[PDB]
Design a protein around this ligand. Structure first.
Ligand code: HEM
Length: 289
């Protein structure tokens, strides 16, 4: 199964920058969402969940097909709450109907990371919407009530190594858990992209508590929380070394997250030899907008 990137007809960098900008301006405008966290975190999570269905073994799933628009995936219990991201992106899609769904969902996550003062994430266009029958089944996204070995094995399906897994997980500096979505509650509710996931893991006094869904989570008095799979990153000594690296080197973390996140968003896609180079979008701030 090959999915070959096909550039939206006639489109170039400037077209996608306009899309980025529309996203970015709406992120700034619609600031009230989720008790003033804004939409950045849920957009990042959307881009991850639309990509995280991928299976390297048969090239099923992944961002290419834009299959989150179909009910089976839209309704995946693992995707609870992402509807808010989809709804945010809806008016963007209506303005730019020529952009593919996979391109839009992935670009939403890139835009969100950048506008939240994260690293630049190079991004490539050319995902093509595929039919409803190409929608992967539910169950390919990860459970949170697991340990490091589960994390490691799970991410092998996405062709991600220890460093890539630890780097990607630093997105958990963003947003929060919502009991009604996932059976977990709380978190810093942060909307600025930093290496604070790793700092929090190492520096907080974590207590293993049971939440109101009767699930275990790690909580601190500062109001931070870690899922069991997050905390596993300091229980496994191979992950712990990388945690410490990223806690002590913001730039390194940025650079590694950018590479891993682009890879995540591109898994499954074959880019022709004369496809455009990846785009690096200017932030609103960089544009004076
Ligand atoms: C073992 C891997 C992972 C598991 C088990 C996991 C699980 C979770 C859970 C349970 C939530 C709470 C959702 C809610 O209650 O609304 C969450 C939130 C989030 N996740 Fe992950 N996640 C994982 C990996 C990742 C990765 C790789 C990324 C991105 C690179 C990511 C980005 C996010 C973001 C941004 C949120 C916050 C959403 C919000 O504030 O609405 N996650 N994830």
């Amino acid at each position: 199964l090959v999915h070959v990137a096909s550039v939206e007809k006639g489109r170039s960098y400037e077209d996608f920058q306009k899309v980025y900008n529309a996203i970015a301006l709406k992120l700034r405008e619609d600031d009230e969402y989720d008790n003033y966290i804004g939409y950045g975190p849920v957009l990042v999570r959307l881009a991850w969940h639309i990509s995280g269905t991928w299976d390297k073994h048969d090239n099923t799933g992944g961002s290419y097909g834009g299959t989150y628009r179909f009910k089976k995936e839209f309704n995946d219990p693992s995707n609870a709450g992402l509807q808010n991201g989809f709804k945010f992106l809806e008016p963007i899609h209506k303005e730019f109907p020529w952009i593919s769904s996979g391109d839009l969902f992935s670009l939403g996550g890139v835009t969100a990371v950048q506008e939240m003062q994260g690293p630049k994430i190079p991004w490539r266009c050319g995902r093509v919407d595929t039919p409803e029958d190409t929608t992967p089944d539910n169950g390919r996204l990860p459970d949170a009530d697991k340990d490091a070995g589960y994390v490691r094995t799970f991410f092998q399906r996405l062709n991600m190594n220890d460093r890539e897994v630890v780097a990607l997980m630093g997105a958990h500096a963003l947003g929060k858990t919502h009991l009604k979505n996932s059976g977990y509650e709380g978190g810093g509710a942060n909307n600025v992209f930093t290496n604070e996931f790793y700092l929090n893991l190492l520096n907080e006094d974590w207590k293993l508590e049971k939440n109101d869904a009767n699930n275990e989570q790690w909580d601190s008095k500062s109001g931070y929380m870690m899922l069991p799979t997050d905390y596993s990153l300091i229980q496994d000594p191979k992950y712990l070394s990388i945690v410490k690296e990223y806690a002590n080197d913001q730039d390194k973390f940025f650079k590694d997250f950018s590479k891993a996140f682009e890879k995540l968003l591109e898994n499954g896609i074959t880019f022709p030899k004369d496809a455009p180079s990846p785009f690096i979008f200017k932030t609103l701030e960089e544009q004076g907008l």
